[PDB]
Amino acid sequence: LTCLICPEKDCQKVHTCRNEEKICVKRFYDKNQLGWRAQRGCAVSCPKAKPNETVQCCSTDKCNK
């Protein structure tokens, strides 16, 4: 499957998650004290996370923002 990935405010680069996985999940953190970090990863499940962090996965082509 193909998904857009790019750890940045305004930016998205197409990627290919060719492997045992199928969907693409993304996780980033945003807090005070000038804090902002993003990280994506291929998988086949959409787990959860803390109420502070942000997580989002997609199971469609060009879906994963």
Task: Find out whether 36 and 27 touch, Cβ atoms under 8 Å.
Answer: no
d(CA 17, CA 62): 12
What is the enclosing helix (H) or strand (E) of 24?
strand 23-31
Joined together, the tokens standing for residue 31 give 């807090």
Domains of the chain in sequence order? 1-65 (2.10.60.10)
Contact 15, 5 (CB under 8 A): yes
Q: Could you give the 3-state DSSP secondary structure of residue 16?
A: strand
Identify the helix (H) or strand (E) that includes residue 28: strand 23-31
The DSSP code for 8 is S
Six-digit token string for 21: 């996985």
Vertex 60, ends 62 and 12: CA angle to 5°? 25
